[PDB]
Design an enzyme around this catalytic site. Structure first.
Site, PDB file in Angstrom:
ATOM      1  N   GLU A   1      23.768   4.165   5.854  1.00  0.00           N
ATOM      2  CA  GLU A   1      22.896   5.304   5.497  1.00  0.00           C
ATOM      3  C   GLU A   1      23.227   5.752   4.071  1.00  0.00           C
ATOM      4  O   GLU A   1      22.393   5.731   3.176  1.00  0.00           O
ATOM      5  CB  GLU A   1      23.051   6.396   6.548  1.00  0.00           C
ATOM      6  CG  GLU A   1      22.612   5.891   7.930  1.00  0.00           C
ATOM      7  CD  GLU A   1      22.096   6.977   8.817  1.00  0.00           C
ATOM      8  OE1 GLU A   1      22.862   7.929   9.077  1.00  0.00           O
ATOM      9  OE2 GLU A   1      20.917   6.887   9.221  1.00  0.00           O
TER      10      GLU A   1
ATOM     11  N   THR B   1      21.377  12.999   9.926  1.00  0.00           N
ATOM     12  CA  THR B   1      20.521  11.942   9.399  1.00  0.00           C
ATOM     13  C   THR B   1      19.450  11.482  10.383  1.00  0.00           C
ATOM     14  O   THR B   1      18.691  10.558  10.037  1.00  0.00           O
ATOM     15  CB  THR B   1      21.340  10.703   8.944  1.00  0.00           C
ATOM     16  OG1 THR B   1      21.853  10.094  10.121  1.00  0.00           O
ATOM     17  CG2 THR B   1      22.435  11.045   7.947  1.00  0.00           C
ATOM     18  N   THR B   2      19.385  12.087  11.546  1.00  0.00           N
ATOM     19  CA  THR B   2      18.288  11.865  12.488  1.00  0.00           C
ATOM     20  C   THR B   2      17.664  13.209  12.795  1.00  0.00           C
ATOM     21  O   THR B   2      18.324  14.228  12.677  1.00  0.00           O
ATOM     22  CB  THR B   2      18.757  11.241  13.826  1.00  0.00           C
ATOM     23  OG1 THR B   2      19.488  12.217  14.588  1.00  0.00           O
ATOM     24  CG2 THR B   2      19.661  10.070  13.639  1.00  0.00           C
TER      25      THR B   2
HETATM   26 ZN   LIG Z   1      24.936   8.994  12.318  1.00  0.00          ZN
END
Ligand SMILES: [Zn+2]
Ligand SMILES: [Cu+2]
EC number: 4.2.1.1
Length: 260
Positions: free
Chosen positions: A106, A198-199
């Site tokens: 990420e 990050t989601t």
């Molecule tokens: Zn994660």
């Protein structure tokens, strides 16, 4: 949070803003770490990863990744120091990974993508529970560790060997007596910045601590991640690969380094 988001063309990161408008917010994650622009911060305190009494419980395929869950009813495994004020308790770890070795992380480092990224998720004990912590701008701390493909990581093998028992969404298995210290690199040198989950729900609660030194895992270990399924049992098979969000705009943030 809410349903139907994922990592496909029709429900992936470019679509999330329609149900989670904070996706276009002022402190979203992940980001590219420009190593030349990050500045050494002498005010950072030493970082303390205290996992000797960590109590793992279970491993779960949640349809987005797999989580290894911990007993967080007491300060059994905590993160302190560095940029952090107070005590952050370990609740779970998970990974993000690619379909190919050249993508999967990420965060990026000078635009370099790693094969995968490990996230150890912790919540600030001053807020009493995880759900309250995610209402606070300093509620969470996530320790991020890059994975590159090379030699096998012995401390990862117990995780790889249980994945055949949690192939599909909603499956879980016992995962007691696992030591997460076997997933760390030698050095605790890090970069830090304020960001987000990050989601979805993309909440802006996270102090990110990203270690500079990657861990090496073998091709065979990461291949086992790629045999997981996004789908439930009995449904059309969709391999769980490329479950990463790309880098987001830095906006009004500075990334700090713990090291010269
Ligand atoms: Zn994660
Ligand atoms: Cu929904």
């Amino acid at each position: 949070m809410s349903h139907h988001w994922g990592y496909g063309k029709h429900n992936g990161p470019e679509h999330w803003h329609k149900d989670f408008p904070i996706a276009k917010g002022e402190r979203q994650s992940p980001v590219d770490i420009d190593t030349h622009t990050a500045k050494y911060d002498p005010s950072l305190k030493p970082l303390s990863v205290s996992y000797d009494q960590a109590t793992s419980l279970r491993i779960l395929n949640n349809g987005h990744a797999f989580n290894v869950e911990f007993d967080d009813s007491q300060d059994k495994a905590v993160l302190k120091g560095g940029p952090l004020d107070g005590t952050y308790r370990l609740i779970q770890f998970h990974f993000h990974w690619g379909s190919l070795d050249g993508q999967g992380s990420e965060h990026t480092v000078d635009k370099k993508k790693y094969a995968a990224e490990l996230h150890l998720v912790h919540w600030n004990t001053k807020y009493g529970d995880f759900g309250k912590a995610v209402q606070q701008p300093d509620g969470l701390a996530v320790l991020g560790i890059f994975l590159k493909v090379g030699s096998a990581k012995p401390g990862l093998q117990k995780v790889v060997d249980v994945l055949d028992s949690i192939k599909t969404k909603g499956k879980s298995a016992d995962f007691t007596n696992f030591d997460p210290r076997g997933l760390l690199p030698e050095s605790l040198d890090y970069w830090t910045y304020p960001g987000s989950l990050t989601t979805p729900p993309l909440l802006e609660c996270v102090t990110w601590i990203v270690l500079k030194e990657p861990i090496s895992v073998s091709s065979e270990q990461v291949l086992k991640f790629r045999k997981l399924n996004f789908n439930g049992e009995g449904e059309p098979e969709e391999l769980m690969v490329d479950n990463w969000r790309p880098a987001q705009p830095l906006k009004n943030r500075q990334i700090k380094a713990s090291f010269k």
